Structure formats: structure tokens, C-alpha cells
């Protein structure tokens with residue numbers, strides 16, 4: 384019947400997903416418009432890779448961009464010798480990422496550029512795609528009959544048939560676009576056929592937040608960035624910061640057409656006033672509400688019961704180290720710091736021990752939200768703003784509002800050199816990143 388736009392899915396076959404992906408300028412039609420974006424595999428979003436734990440992924444990235452790039456397997460707890468953020472793939476050159484999917488992993492992940500200084504333009508232009516890890520838990524009766532869909536939330540601005548260029552204000556704020564798209568389409572309609580939906584949600588935007596709400600419906604959170612919750616958590620709305628993912632169940636209990644919306648949200652984005660001879664940041668205030676899609680329930684909907692439980696969160700050793708990481712900004716210079724320093728790929732900032740557990744206290748001493756991301760080592764958010772976190776699940780991005788402290792339980796897994804940074808990728812490019820070495 385009706386065809387909701389969703390990225391094409393490449394599945395592993397016989398334990399192997401082998402794929403060649405070109406990063407290339409791509410003439411496209413989207414939102415009733417012609418524009419040339421940067422894409423992987425010629426699609427915006429890029430293709431969804433779908434794997435199982437212990438599959439081998441062999442992705443050869445061919446750089447057909449006029450500038451160097453690389454890949455980050457966002458959220459995958461794999462060796463930084465594979466997920467190497469320091470690697471530069473020159474134009475015309477290629478690189479083959481090979482890794483084995485970790486053994487008990489489940490959920491929605493994604494891939495995107497990670498060459499320092501070029502992440503924000505390259506991501507904004509369209510370079511992103513999803514990776515879905517199937518789980519034995521998906522076979523339980525309360526999940527195996529749900530209708531599954533991926534929603535890639537990513538906004539865009541267009542100027543002269545190209546992605547709009549980054550202005551000095553964009554480097555300060557992180558760039559939001561006026562086209563608020565789902566899976567590259569403007570306000571699509573999803574016509575459900577089963578009464579229980581599993582929606583895999585990905586915020587692949589540079590800086591835009593999505594305060595998600597479905598008319599007349601709660602959402603049952605069942606997974607965070609990097610794995611299942613212990614049990615479904617009913618919520619009335621769900622904030623997704625840049626880089627975060629979530630999976631929710633929607634129980635359609637009556638016929639109709641329902642709007643999925645991004646409600647107003649104030650992330651601390653700023654205008655600028657130049658008066659006298661002095662410049663001053665000025666709060667932009669909350670976002671305008673946005674319709675993301677229209678959801679239409681099937682005939683006579685009979686949703687099944689929720690799963691009573693999902694996946695028990697592992698027991699972890701007591702931490703041996705607590706670290707303080709302070710985020711700050713020089714807004715008018717569009718410079719961003721951790722512990723008073725900007726990123727220097729030459730400089731190692733934290734050195735920890737593999738197979739130990741640390742507590743990281745991340746403190747936002749700036750004026751904007753900063754969503755803090757760590758590679759390689761998924762963490763358990765213990766508290767934010769002094770309030771205990773409402774569920775247990777692996778996460779790899781945590782949003783910090785101005786003034787907030789997050790306490791994170793960080794088990795150090797794979798050895799090697801990796802990074803942590805703000806996932807407003809303009810801030811990352813402008814210095815809000817540090818280096819962690821695990822030995």
C-alpha cells in the first residue's frame with residue numbers, strides 16, 4: 384500500500400556485511416527542491432546497515448569528496464584501532480573498516496564523519512547513516528510482532544542548490560536548518576499496519592534538539608543510545624539531543640491520524656547584538672514547534688501487552704577513580720573548552736586503566752546545552768542535575784544544560800587512544816574535545 388520513506392537496509396548475510404560506500408556529492412530531489420548534498424551510497428540518509436552480534440562488518444569507504452574525511456562508528460564499543468578518529472582519508476583514497484559486532488550489543492547506532500575541523504560541514508551536508516544491531520531479545524512475543532521503523536531526525540538548510548554554508552554564528556551555536564526532515568523527507572505520513580510500533584529514533588542533526596511528543600499517546604522507552612532498558616519506561620515526551628538514539632514502543636489503541644511533533648525547546652542558542660563598539664550574545668529562546676510526521680493507525684487496533692522486562696543491566700565493580708571535566712565557552716570567539724583547554728590531537732588529557740571503572744563528573748559551566756559524548760566506552764548515567772537517572776541502560780551521549788553536572792559510571796573496555804567531546808559538532812570542531820588513553 385503506502386510507502387513511508389525510510390533508508391534502504393543492507394543486511395549481513397552469512398555472518399558478513401561487506402559493502403563499498405562512496406562519500407560523494409549527490410544531486411537529489413528532496414522537499415520539492417533540487418540540491419546537491421554529500422551522501423554515502425548516493426542516499427540521504429545513507430543506507431541502514433543491519434547486523435547481529437558477532438557479525439563481521441567490512442565497510443570500504445571511498446572518499447570521493449574534495450576534502451579529507453574519515454568514519455566514526457558512533458556508539459559501537461569497538462577498538463579505537465578500528466574506530467580511529469585520528470585517521471585522515473585523502474580525497475580519492477579508500478579505507479576498509481573491519482570489525483566484529485560485540486557479543487551482547489543491541490540497539491540503534493550510526494556512522495558519520497569524524498575528521499576534526501570538518502565534521503560540522505560534512506555532517507550538515509548529508510553524510511550520515513544508521514546501524515541497527517538485532518538482539519535475541521527481539522524474538523520475545525511482546526516484541527517479535529511489532530512493526531519496526533527507523534526515524535532519522537536530521538534538519539537541513541539549502542542555499543543555491545547546496546547545503547547552506549556555515550556562518551560565524553553557526554560555529555558559535557551549532558547549525559540548525561529550516562527544513563526539519565524525517566528520513567530525508569518533509570512531514571511524511573506513516574500508515575501503520577500493526578498496532579504495536581517499534582520506532583528506532585536517531586538524532587543525526589548537527590545541533591537541533593527534538594523534544595518528541597506523539598499526539599494522544601505516551602511513548603514506552605525500551606532502549607537508550609547503546610542498549611535496552613531493564614523494563615519499559617512510560618514517558619509523555621522524549622528529548623533527543625544531537626547524537627542520541629532511543630527506541631520506543633507505541634501502542635496504537637484507536638483509529639485516527641496523529642502528529643509526531645518536536646515541541647518547543649530552548650537549548651541556549653544565541654543571537655548577537657552589536658551596539659556601542661561591543662558585541663553581546665543574546666538568548667534566542669525556545670524552538671518553534673515542528674511537525675515531524677503524521678501517524679495513521681490501522682483498522683481496529685489491538686496492541687499486545689508490553690514486555691514485563693527487557694534486559695538486566697550488568698553488575699559493575701566499584702569505581703577506582705573519579706574525574707572532573709568542566710565545559711566552558713568563549714561565545715564571541717566561538718571557542719569551546721574542556722578543563723580550560725581546546726582540543727589538541729597531540730595531547731593526551733586522561734590516562735586510565737582497561738578493566739577498571741571510573742566515575743566522570745561532567746560539569747557544564749557554559750550558557751548553552753552541551754551533549755557530552757565518549758567514544759569506545761559506553762557509560763551509565765547515574766545522575767544529572769543532582770537527580771538520579773530514571774532508568775539503567777548504556778548511553779554514549781548525555782545532555783547537560785547550563786550549570787548541570789552529570790555523574791557517569793564509565794567502565795574502561797578497549798585499550799588505546801580515543802576522544803570525548805561535545806556532540807554539537809560545531810563546538811567539537813571549535814575545540815570542545817579531549818583525548819583519553821586506556822592502557
Ligand SMILES: [Cu+2]
Nearest residue numbers: 455457495626
Ligand atoms: Cu557521533
Ligand SMILES: [Cu+2]
Nearest residue numbers: 753805807810
Ligand atoms: Cu557544545
Ligand SMILES: [Cu+2]
Nearest residue numbers: 455756758804
Ligand atoms: Cu566523536
